[PDB]
Design a binder for this molecule. Sequence first.
Ligand code: NA
Ligand SMILES: [Zn+2]
Ligand SMILES: [Zn+2]
Ligand SMILES: [Zn+2]
Length: 88
Amino acid sequence: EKPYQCDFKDCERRFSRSDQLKRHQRRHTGVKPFQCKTCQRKFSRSDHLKTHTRTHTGEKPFSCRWPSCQKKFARSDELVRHHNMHQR
DNA sequence: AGCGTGGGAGT
DNA sequence: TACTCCCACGC
Ligand code: NA
Ligand SMILES: [Zn+2]
Ligand SMILES: [Zn+2]
Ligand SMILES: [Zn+2]
């Protein structure tokens, strides 16, 4: 199921796909290909750079679906937490 | 709350 | 492979 093993010392992680292993291995190497042009912070992943950028732009693409609630969020996981809050 | 950081997955 | 999206841990 997860044939791509991480061979770094004392790491037991295994992955379904080669690209998942490559991304994981950036944790060990510290290689960070992406940079925010606003604050120069570096990231190992482009999706992390994308959501970080919303800290500068104020974009909040995720709207609460509860009727009459107008709250918005920069990330889908913030909206999940918020929805969990409406539903006790 | 706000967000760095992470795996699992669709494409 | 890479880009993208989801949900999640932990502060
Ligand atoms: Na990418
Ligand atoms: Zn590893
Ligand atoms: Zn920045
Ligand atoms: Zn709401």
